[PDB]
Amino acid sequence: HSLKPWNTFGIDHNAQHIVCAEDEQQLLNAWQYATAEGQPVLILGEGSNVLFLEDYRGTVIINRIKGIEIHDEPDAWYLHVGAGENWHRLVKYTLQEGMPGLENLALIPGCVGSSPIQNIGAYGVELQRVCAYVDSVELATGKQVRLTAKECRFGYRDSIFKHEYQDRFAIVAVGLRLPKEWQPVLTYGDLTRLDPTTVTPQQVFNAVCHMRTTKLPDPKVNGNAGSFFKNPVVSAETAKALLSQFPTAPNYPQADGSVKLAAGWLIDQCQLKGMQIGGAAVHRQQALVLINEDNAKSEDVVQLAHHVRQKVGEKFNVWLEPEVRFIGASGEVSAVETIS
């Protein structure tokens, strides 16, 4: 009944059933049985991106479909990875096998199956960069389907799986394409200190992990779901109006002229680091991250998010949108709405 070991936030709510699907047939059967009993179904990889708001009235299927296949093409390595494979382990694996291209995405928690959902990205790379396709099983029909990287409609922490393909499909495998001709992505932070000629994949790996382990909390220590909010994209004007008064605001100018702001900075500027509500708190090393500091109740996390969002809204008139999926009793609910 407890979901606590199934979500990195460490939230303790219960589910009617929790089932591990070692293969697709198991996931499908589990889904069929639950929906026949009129129950809702939630598929989880590592629950490192979900906030359970209360007891779940249905079945939670832990996707553990494992296996990796490497297909060689003259120009690149094609990996067909089971949805249940651990992402970080895959990254280390690929590097170990001399198939670089995933190092910037090192240490990101979760399963491979969940990687396309919010287009995992960090340190200059997003999964869309190395994603070839994503294979799913249409839960209600059993029909396996494949979406090319383009048909996935990848965006900043976004994909078709968060919209049109949500719930209808269960991701069972992800295909990655790693060019044989490696080219390091050294555009982000401390990575710019490295030399594109001398640098090795492993060196980028370590550089990335160093920045991560110095800023992000390990869920083993304090439960968390990473960045709690997305970095907001404001219009070029709001950015004009904001950067004048707050000149040192980290901002990332967008294609269409709009501008992304660093949410962690906005929160930090509100002196929110270390702020706690109940057992939840704003991480002192990276304010964008809310943590389960001491037996946090989900409501502690919701109210802390609300406070953070409000303070940042009053000060910068920039309204933060959660990146974490909020799971209500019958399924995902509107996070923003929940923390409004």
Ligand SMILES: Cc1cc2nc3c(=O)[nH]c(=O)nc-3n(C[C@H](O)[C@H](O)[C@H](O)COP(=O)(O)OP(=O)(O)OC[C@H]3O[C@@H](n4cnc5c(N)ncnc54)[C@H](O)[C@@H]3O)c2cc1C
């Ligand atoms: C410490 C920490 C650091 C993080 N760093 C980063 C980062 O640098 N960049 C980044 O992008 N993200 C980051 N994250 C966010 C997180 O790792 C990603 O969202 C990740 O993809 C979640 O994987 P998961 O398997 O745990 O998904 P879950 O939390 O289990 O599920 C995510 C969502 O997708 C659904 N889903 C899960 N598996 C499947 C499937 N097979 N089929 C259908 N739906 C499925 C779930 O129902 C849910 O809606 C971080 C999280 C933590 C705790």
Ligand SMILES: C=C(O[C@H]1[C@H](O)[C@@H](CO)O[C@H](OP(=O)(O)OP(=O)(O)OC[C@H]2O[C@@H](n3ccc(=O)[nH]c3=O)[C@H](O)[C@@H]2O)[C@@H]1NC(C)=O)C(=O)O
């Ligand atoms: C951890 C996650 O992803 C992380 C990802 O690892 C890093 C690096 O690529 O970039 C995002 O954080 P981020 O934008 O805050 O990355 P950061 O480099 O740490 O910092 C951005 C700017 O904010 C500043 N910053 C951040 C937190 C803070 O308390 N104070 C502060 O000033 C930084 O110094 C920096 O100049 C991700 N988030 C999103 C929501 O886009 C996650 O999604 O869960």
